[PDB]
Amino acid sequence: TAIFSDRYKGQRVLGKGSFGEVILCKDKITGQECAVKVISKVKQKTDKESLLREVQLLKQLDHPNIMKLYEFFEDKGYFYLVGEVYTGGELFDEIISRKRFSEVDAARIIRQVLSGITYMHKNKIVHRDLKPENLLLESKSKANIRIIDFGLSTHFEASKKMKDKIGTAYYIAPEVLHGTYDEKCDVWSTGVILYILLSGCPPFNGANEYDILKKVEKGKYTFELPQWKKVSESAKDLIRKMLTYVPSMRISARDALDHEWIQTYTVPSLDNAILNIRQFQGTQKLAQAALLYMGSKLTSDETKELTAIFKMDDGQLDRAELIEGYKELEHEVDQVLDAVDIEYSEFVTVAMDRKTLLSRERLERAFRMFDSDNSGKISSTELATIFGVSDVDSETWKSVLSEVDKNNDGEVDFDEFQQMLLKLCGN
Numbered sequence: 191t192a193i194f195s196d197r198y199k200g201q202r203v204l205g206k207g208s209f210g211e212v213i214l215c216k217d218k219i220t221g222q223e224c225a226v227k228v229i230s231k232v233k234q235k236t237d238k239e240s241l242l243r244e245v246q247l248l249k250q251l252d253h254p255n256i257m258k259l260y261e262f263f264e265d266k267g268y269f270y271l272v273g274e275v276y277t278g279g280e281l282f283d284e285i286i287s288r289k290r291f292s293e294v295d296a297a298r299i300i301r302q303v304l305s306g307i308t309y310m311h312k313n314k315i316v317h318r319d320l321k322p323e324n325l326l327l328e329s330k331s332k333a334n335i336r337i338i339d340f341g342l343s344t345h346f347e348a349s350k351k352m353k354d355k356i357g358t359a360y361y362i363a364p365e366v367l368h369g370t371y372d373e374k375c376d377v378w379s380t381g382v383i384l385y386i387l388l389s390g391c392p393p394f395n396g397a398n399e400y401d402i403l404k405k406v407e408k409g410k411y412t413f414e415l416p417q418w419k420k421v422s423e424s425a426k427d428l429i430r431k432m433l434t435y436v437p438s439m440r441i442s443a444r445d446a447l448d449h450e451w452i453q454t455y456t457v458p459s460l461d462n463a464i465l466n467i468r469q470f471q472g473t474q475k476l477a478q479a480a481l482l483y484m485g486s487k488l489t490s491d492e493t494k495e496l497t498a499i500f501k502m503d504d505g506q507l508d509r510a511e512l513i514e515g516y517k518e519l520e521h522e523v524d525q526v527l528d529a530v531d532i533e534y535s536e537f538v539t540v541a542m543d544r545k546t547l548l549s550r551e552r553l554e555r556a557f558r559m560f561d562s563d564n565s566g567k568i569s570s571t572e573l574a575t576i577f578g579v580s581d582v583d584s585e586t587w588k589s590v591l592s593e594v595d596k597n598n599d600g601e602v603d604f605d606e607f608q609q610m611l612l613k614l615c616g617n
């Protein structure tokens with residue numbers, strides 16, 4: 191009965207989310223700001239009665255390391271999950287900005303994650319999809335960590351699209367892959383995050399999604415990297431208990447809080463681990479940005495559908511007709527007409543070019559951030575890692591690279607990298 195739009199109004203986009211987009215919304219009466227995830231009816235893993243009883247329980251739970259869920263709405267085409275706003279950004283984006291990072295800083299982070307998990311397991315809730323992207327900070331500083339999507343992510347079907355799958359294979363418990371899993375899968379995922387905090391490298395890695403999942407399924411890893419020599423044996427011992435293969439023999443979330451490592455450490459800088467987490471995060475973010483650029487190019491579909499609507503027609507249209515044309519597919523129309531002042535062809539051309547330039551700018555920021563030595567280029571070896579994480583076939587991107595520039599000599603600048611992505615999405 192209760193309608194979302196009768197209570198909240200959208201303000202601005204907050205970012206991407208699993209199963210849906212996240213919008214900053216404001217209560218039309220009290221002015222309370224809220225984070226709203228909009229899930230487009232994404233298949234349902236359970237019946238409607240199971241989702242209602244889970245949401246009812248989740249709304250009553252309260253922990254400082256768990257995101258607060260306020261409301262839940264549903265209409266013919268979407269589900270709306272209304273919760274609290276956390277403005278500190280993603281945890282790993284904060285870690286890469288720091289000059290120093292020690293074993294105390296890592297233990298302080300992992301104590302908060304484990305506190306949240308222990309509390310949710312007491313209430314029979316399983317996350318399953320715990321990963322760095324679901325660890326948000328209340329403020330942008332070295333701040334309380336809030337775990338996102340705890341108990342919600344499992345009621346919806348996992349997206350098969352690589353844009354949503356990037357940064358997930360590293361953290362999934364092996365038993366989740368084979369189908370029989372319980373709350374112990376959340377301890378495995380935290381054990382993987384702890385391994386990355388102390389070395390900057392994932393324990394289970396590979397050239398592509400499937401190669402990572404093969405390493406996870408075997409469950410073998412090592413502490414044989416120069417970084418690990420500067421880490422205590424108490425940290426390595428906790429990681430071993432957390433990354434125990436058989437779930438019944440794996441340590442509980444509660445017993446991990448009571449581990450000597452967490453009690454002792456909650457301080458030499460792990461310099462090589464910071465350099466590696468920066469490279470890891472840069473790679474993940476540029477692969478995501480590359481997929482969202484290709485996604486936005488195919489969507490901008492919008493240019494073809496808007497032309498067939500604007501039926502509505504001298505090669506010219508009034509201001510009100512252009513507003514009606516956009517609403518079928520007010521301030522945004524005036525910003526396009528400002529650069530012009532009109533013909534409907536020049537309006538769509540100026541509006542499309544405005545969305546193209548802004549799409550190019552988000553990709554460019556990710557490219558610049560990946561290019562940490564400010565060389566202006568990325569090597570063929572770096573392209574192989576980026577296209578590996580984004581699941582673009584080796585022969586396909588190498589052919590496209592030769593088409594863009596026959597004399598590339600194993601490197602690409604931003605313009606060339608952008609040209610490669612256009613050809614990889616039919617442009």
Ligand SMILES: Cc1cccc(-c2nc(N)sc2-c2ccc3ncccc3n2)c1
Binds near residue numbers: 207212226
């Ligand atoms: C169930 C639910 C409801 C509303 C949002 C989300 C949510 N899911 C994600 N995967 S990121 C996110 C979130 C939360 C709060 C945020 N606050 C400020 C910026 C980005 C944010 N993003 C989950």
